[model samples]
Target chain A: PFESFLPEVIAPERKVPYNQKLIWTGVSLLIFLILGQIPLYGIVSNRGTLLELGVSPIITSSMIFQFLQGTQLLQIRPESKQDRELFQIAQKVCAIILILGQALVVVMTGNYGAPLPICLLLIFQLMFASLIVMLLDELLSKGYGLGSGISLFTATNIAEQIFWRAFAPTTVNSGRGKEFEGAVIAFFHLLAVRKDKKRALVEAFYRTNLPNMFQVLMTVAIFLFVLYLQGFRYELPIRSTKVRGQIGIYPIKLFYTSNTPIMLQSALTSNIFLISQILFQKYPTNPLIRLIGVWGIQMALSGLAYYIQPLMSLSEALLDPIKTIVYITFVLGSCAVFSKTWIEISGTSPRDIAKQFKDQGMVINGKRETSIYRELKKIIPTAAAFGGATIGALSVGSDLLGTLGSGASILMATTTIYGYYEAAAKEGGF
Target chain B: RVDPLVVLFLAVGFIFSVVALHVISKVAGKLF
Candidate 1:
């Protein structure tokens, strides 16, 4: 198999010490941050650098293979060492292909606005950078680090962006003289500089072009709300048959599908937007092309693209009620659909849970061995759909309020942070 | 740009592929 040639982070034969794990995680994070700031050669603008694609290619390829496994298109007995190795090899191969594909697509779409030779160089750099990211994530997940590199990178990146939006000292001209870009800085600056205190307060809270105090407030509110929601779960009491008195409560969280639905929905929408935007740019005047996607100066204004585009603020929703309604309905519906489907494919379905319980010599307190699946089937599906819908609703509400760094980002960040906290607490036995 | 209808068709095709895989797996299970 090609696995022999693929480079891998050698898994630790012994248990990794906590301090050593921390050092590895920190080093990986430091590299990721430094890579984010380093500009690529032959790029005229500062659009993004080596980490432009980030973990996306790896994630996409992983998701594709996961779906293939779920659909039974790729059969494997995960318990078998040979099958497991085959799976890893297949995933790595897929990830490499995706890295090349994404890099080629980005350059071909003229996003970098560079010559053919420079574009070729850009693709090479991007693919190499993505490979590094993939390996870094592998290094972390292979027990050398505290948590998976993907989650660490995402959480850190989102936290940085949110902090930048809140306290950055950068100034920009928004047609009303120079204003601070960061909401908190802008608020203090406006309050101190303007003679009319009331108007200054109003402007700081409701600025259109810059991050506003309201957005900051919304960000904090969403963060707290997601934390609260994370605590919501239904616990099922189970008893171990082998250990007569041993019992435990299995927690099925309110986020049964825990951010997967939103992640899938976002992936679907972004790909649609990317493809449609490329087509629109190439055939600007084609009637059919316009129907698929209509682009305004910087955003989708009409057609299928417009309907799926998120409502950034209350004013945007008010300005186009149809777009707002369409977006909300589609998001909630798709989220619910994806959540339901995800549970089945991800081995969290009632049957899978039932089999897991059976293997562990455990069963629900009141249910027979054969009836465990039925008992779980009732609550799992409900939780999956409702939890997905609730997350979708929360995302939409935050987006409408113009939360800093977008609602989806906040939701993802909250989950990632909360996950780390749980892992740390569990590891510490606290 | 490809037709929106073609996108719809592609999605349907994906759904069919999954369904087909399910059937094949089921058949294989019984045979094995």
Candidate 2:
């Protein structure tokens, strides 16, 4: 069982006004984009609803972010373990979505080839998600007697996420047009707000957008500051660790604690693809390969053995037997393997754990300092040894089955697509 | 999804992303 150091969902707040503003920000942008249709209408062409979700991290991920927002899961103070858990929940979701999506493409294409158009769409989804969240926030602020800023930032991001998941491949319940129509209807209502009626739509738009412009400027400043922080580096004190009687030195990448094992897993898979290419080229067998000059590994291997030859080149066509048995066995296993390993290499060590616990004023030895430091060195490697063996068994099985895609595939195997739908369900993006 | 409506919608987007396609069809009004 995982020891949770963070809260899993948004803790409730008595502040209904906060939720109100957040919800409206989504409404504001839903309106803006629905008006996104007018431009499309002038042209006499068959225009499909371009649901510019601006991101499609995963149907699951978008749902998770939205659910947290709606249920007030993120409303809790960060001092509690709940905050940390939710944050990890988000990080691990990204890590998994990227891995599984990446892995499926690689396994099928024999490399990461989700097509240029698809990649562009995914990027587009992530970039503009904030628009919805912010607009919704602005909408709710006037009635609640609270500052619109909180609702603006938090709510819009959820809207962006909601839109992304709505566009995900798995959830194909409705088309983008229906979503856009709803958003436009929402926008129409917002635009009609006037001072005489005292509904405050007119006041809210000007108040939100004016401050919004300045907020944009402030956001740009903060963004530059973060970029500056990226340039600052803290050097780790270098010490020599010996391996096999030869002195070895470790240099950490400015990034963080990850190992070559993750990268190696990728490069090794590439070699398999490469080897398959060479075999098919040299032998000049298989009708598909003879035509295309290479069969993705399985096909080449199948061809080599004279088993199920000719290869499944069409992506959808190949998913029959492969999806249920091979895909799950390998993909989930490897992802779980990597997440566990990655957690170990840089995540937690017995020595580091000892240091932290000691920081909390615990005694480790006959004396004080000496006991804690001594215990620090003792437990990490012992825990690491156990963690490593378990990971190895899982990863090898996945790799053999051709499941390993990218980092954190294991987590993908573990959780529901980061609970994105939970957000949409609350907002009625569903 | 082979739904005719979906196909019609995408055909619209494809035409929009490409300038030359728009020019040839002369459907390019104020839709930038």
Candidate 3:
């Protein structure tokens, strides 16, 4: 009705070439990185600043609505002409509510050392800053930039983390002893400083230590594995009527829902962690709240939260065998379930795709509606389930094997970058 | 207060990513 909801922020019509759009995308990513550095005023610690939350609120909210839609509890109205407009507003609403609740709970519980007034200000600062990120994303997706902003941010953030952890000279104290915390720096320290080079090398790599060679290798392996997963696809052949001599295959990728499902799982677990921490803070001796969540060094001490805490290495798994098994099962089950649901709400559903095909007057393998639907129904769901479970398995395995930037972050960063590369290639036709 | 080490890492990371993005943009430019 108003030429899209954000009428004041409407971009003017202009012809932006693919490469130019990509530059805009890069600029937006740089801006995001800059924003992540700015510390909130009246904050005691700058390490876990407001921007550290990054895109989690938007991601979690979207996942919630998507999950609800899959369960048939929520019905999205595509029949209305204003569906796109309505959905945008709905997304903002969900994100705002979630961000407010999370920021409030986290600040109240975690001892930010501020009065209620400052806490309220901090919450608003976090919410508004995150909203800016969502807006930047809109700029990209609205055909003014390249690749999805969510994926772009994910790629940039994780890549930055990985690189910094590998190369930084920052020192950290742990069980292994004091040295540089970076993988490369530690390796150098071991090689250059020790005459007993073999043992030092083993200590630098094979030891159950943080920022080890094992984690670096594991990161690369998982990155490559996710890349490989992105490769295998069940392509559905289709014909185009608008452009002559044009035929295409709509690929249902093995990692169909990408890393969205796992990310959703992470966000859900963290919310549980957050709420439980708040409850535990209020009622310290309450066993019921402790069962929900309890504070460890940085994660859950034990209870339900421990099972979803995400194993960082094999030693962690060995420390809690039951927790490890439960975690694996939970991740795999959640991935599969959410993956299927994501398809339903995200327009990857068989019926929606069928509608797209019919709109183009394109029939699948020269078959009419019913047969085409039959073929798609058989393939899509199976691929979605397989993709979900495989990603779950890969993430768990990668974490256990000592991946860098955590398991989900690495998977997300690699897959998203790969997606960007493909999309860039397509846009350029090169 | 934020850790000074974090800021140092961020500075280096930013420089690295900026270079990476520039290289990517150049490659994309050449191919396109």
Candidate 4:
């Protein structure tokens, strides 16, 4: 049904050259970045734009479909051509529906105070923009690019955000005086102009309104920490039964799910916040709204949502010990649960791997072929859970230390770049 | 105030361009 309106898939007659892949990837990234800067046609306020929702709707839609399929509610198998096509069409349809729904939510709750027609226009523009993003992701992942478009967009956006925060030349007036927005520039300017060097240095290091040196320090620390953690893995020896003296090892990394749990957790939390904020705007005094979350300047003050929200800084964490503890517990526990669920849904479970190994005529070196599933069952689940918990801990730690960008964004960028690095190394021997 | 007709025209143009690109890619695939 969607074939009539869905964007046609790119089909290459021959293998896409490495250079061509690189160029296409670069083109898509440039286009996405340019789109990010462009505002919508008719908006009363500058607060909400076409890309305001980003890829949340698409991710949410994909997660919903995956959950349905995993729970056996959606009876479709990817192994069959007909079922695969059906599944793809269903995903595209769900994404479009989500785009429309989210666009409506964004425009209505934006407090734009625009007329009805203009509000509809804003919603339509946002929906179209999101659809374009979805199509771009499909285009890249089909074969025309180096890596998936979603990860590339996310990593690039995070990197750009961090760079802008660290070295931006823009200035802002924050009551103290006109200060450089960039942490590095602000530090130098403060040291040069201020009469009291000690106060200047201290202010530059700990200023809340602008990016500070401490935040930059935490960013670098977290970047290096995640890179260090990305290298730990467990290798299981295996041998091919068909070929004499043929042996190899299957390595399951500490991050068995590889940033998926964090991605899902961030999406889940952001959606909750989005819904709560919209509801609070409509029913400010309702007890139910307050219980869900009470919004005060951009941060939740006291509610169920507040307890799960990321800590902005060390001072904030120290100020509210209970919220901090609850937030940590929520992050760790949710990450583990998401990780376990993701493996089953994504077809990366022990049973799936055992079947794959059997089909490839391989078995554990020291164990019987019948016990392959049991062996993997012992390791994969534990790795997934512990790995997820570790990722959550690192994210929380960076958040508490006040990284320049949010800790989740930085962690995601690092993991994504690492994935690209491995891919580059494997493909081109770089 | 911005004209609604102009917004509609621009949207149509944008959609046309995307569709044209896909058509071109499809034809190119067949030719090569």
Candidate 5:
């Protein structure tokens, strides 16, 4: 049904060299950045559509499908016609829904200089950009590029945000009049002018005008931590059944699901918070809404909704033990459950993986070489469970300590970079 | 409000924790 959307390409039989793949990946990434900068036509909002809506629809919609697939409510067959059809249609549907819906909200919240007609134009621009992202992603992944488009865009987004925000030197009101918005610049400015350097530095780093040096350091740490985890894996030695000397180890990384669990959880939390805030604003005294979640002066003070609210600091974490504990447990549980579910739908299920390996004429080094599924069963679920919980813990801890990009973003960015690096290394014969 | 010195100390401690956290994540990463 959605065959028309698929780009027709004549793929060459010969292997494309690594350098060419690198060039294509770079080209795709540059296109994504360009799309992000291109403002929509006929929109009067100071915040342009591209920067504000870049890949958000794609991410949001993909998460929706991933949630469905992860929960086993809907399953699409791997590498099948149905899967392709479903994915293509879902992308279109998701783009429309997110673009129109978000554009409507933007129009309402801020003055967008137009009513219904303008809404369509705005949505059109956003929808077009979203489709372009999807195409760019496909361009790289379909034998032309090295890594997945989603990961590349996500990593670039977060990394760019951090890098720019840390050193841009854009002046803004930290309420003390014309302080540099970037954390590093703010810190330096504070140190340069103030005689009482102690107080200046304190206010610079601790003041919540923007992300601070501490958060910057946390971002770096989280980046390194994620890099370490991507490389951390268990090796299962394998030998081909037919090829006499052919041998290798199929590594099962500790973070088998990578950032999916944390990303999904964050998406869930952010949506919940957005909805609650809207509802609370509309019906301030509604008992049901209040029971679900209500904003407090400094933070979320009560209810099931309070648990997922981003904790600002270590002190806040300590002060709100109930919220922290509940949040940690809930996030950890969700991740654990989702990890297993994600693997099942994504064709990383032990039985399916074992079948794939066997079909390729490979067997594990263990005694029961006949069925690699048995060996996999002992390891895969365990990895999923542990990985999910560890990520959950780390994310919560980082948020509690007030990390720069939020824990989830940092992890996702780092892991994607790590994967790209590894792929490049292999391609370069390193 | 907390003392400036205390905030400074905390900042130093937080930086330490950042390194410590990296080590811990790597260690935890290996265990799985």
Candidate 6:
């Protein structure tokens, strides 16, 4: 049989020279991208009403924000506590107004209106604010904070109704993110299991990499890395308490509970949104649903977090219904459950605390010195559930939405914002 | 228009091609 792996225009090969192999691949990409552009591009070229008001403005604002943020100009300090509160309240107020006004305009104008002067001005300001928030180095150094670009973008896009009708039939330019997502799903099965399904996935990977041992090795490495990152974390004690005359207990958390599950779930939801037709039951012949299914599931299970709590900022949260719900549920449920579970599993009980304090030459309150450990035993498990639930809610939240996109993109952004914050905090100012 | 099955063929063909190309690139990548 003719060798299928041989270099050819029909299917380019990396074994060939870069330019020669990439020539056909590049052309194919250009062809598909051009095909996607045909209908939309023609309309945009003809000054289509949708593009004129919606795409142009949104893209313009995004670019403008990018510049301002890069230049590092927009930082506001409330000075006093009152001023800080005022600044926060003002953001809340303006954000809400922006959300309502934009959502209305989107529904009414359907991207046809020039958008009222007030809304347009706010959008422009938002774009600029985004760049400032993102690019501002000194702002964060002092006490400013994480990026707000995602929230700003989501608000504007929701107002523009872009999410509702962004896709086109007969042509698509976006990569669909399926490949990365599919690989993600494969890893979930590979690490978390070894069922028939996982075996099928393993087979698929081998088949995809057959005749190329290098590809095989790289694929295996990716799965191994994923497992390492997701492996069991060593929990450390952070808080402890003494109950009654002789009671004392300790509280602690895992070292790295990162890239929270809220992120993966949201990414999945948004992927569902990006191609609504796929999720829609009536659209059988659509073929889009089948495409997303291949990899979207993996994108959903990327993290261990079951959900994230919606940001209290209505303006930010309103854009994604599923995200809001998932976040809220995850924040409330997972924090309460995991916080307690880890305490027990990690052996950070009152007994451990008793031993450590004794070694350090410390004793519990004088009232019940000998029975202090026993008294505090009950406090460790029960109180942890309650206290962990409360503190975990806030801490986990800081890990999730301090940043924003679609459900998935925003979810990813939120997780990433906190990640950068933690990383920079460890490194400190640089 | 081409037959409906031809479209499925193209879809499968595209999936296989993209997967192969990406894998091949990684394999030939000049790294340890």
Distance (Å) between predicted and true CA of A392, model 1?
1.2
lDDT, candidate 5, A110-149, per-residue tens:
5566457666656655554555555555557667777788
Give the worst 10-residue stretch by lDDT in candidate 2 chain A. Answer: A39-48
Q: Report how far residue A92 has shifted in candidate 6, in Å.
A: 51
The CAPRI category of model 3 is incorrect
True contacts kept of each: 0.00, 0.00, 0.00, 0.00, 0.00, 0.00
- Per-residue lDDT tens digits for candidate 3, residues A1-430, read 2332331134537866876676777777776777676556546523565474677777788878777776776566678877666666677766777877887777777667745777776676666666566666766776777667777776776787789878878787667566887888889888998768878888888655467887787777777766766789877777776666677778777888977898888878778778777877788767677677667776767677766787765677788798888878888988999999889878889888778777886765565666777788899998898888998898778767766667788777777777777877876642
Q: Provide the global lDDT of candidate 6 against the true structure.
A: 0.40
lDDT of each: 0.78, 0.38, 0.72, 0.78, 0.71, 0.40
Docking class of 2: incorrect
Off by over 4 Å in 6: A1-313, A316-329, A357-362, A390-392, A395-430, B1-32
Local accuracy of candidate 1 as per-residue lDDT tens digits, A241-336:
988998889988898787888988888888988998888888877888877767897787668887888887567778988888788889999999
Q: What ranges in model 5 sit over 4 Å off?
A: A1-13, A44-47, A50-53, A56-135, A173-177, A193-205, A278-290, A293-295, A298-300, B1-32
For model 6, what is the error of residue A416's alpha carbon versus the real structure, in angstroms, after optimal superposition? 16
Model with the higher lDDT, candidate 1 or 6: 1
TM-score of chain B of each: 0.81, 0.48, 0.70, 0.83, 0.55, 0.75
Off by over 4 Å in 3: A1-12, A40-138, A172-178, A207-209, A239-247, A273-312, A315-327, A366-369, B1-32
Worst 10 residues of 1 chain A by lDDT: A38-47
Q: After superposition, how far is residue A338 of candidate 4 from its true place, in Å?
A: 3.3
Q: Which rank order by TM-score, best down to worst?
A: 1, 4, 5, 3, 2, 6
Query: Residue by residue across B8-28, what tens digits does model 4's lDDT show?
Result: 354457655545655786798
Tell me which residue pairs clash in candidate 1: none
| lDDT score for residue A246 of model 5 | 86
| lDDT: worst 10-residue window of model 4 chain B | B1-10
Each predicted complex: what DockQ?
Answer: 0.01, 0.03, 0.02, 0.03, 0.01, 0.01
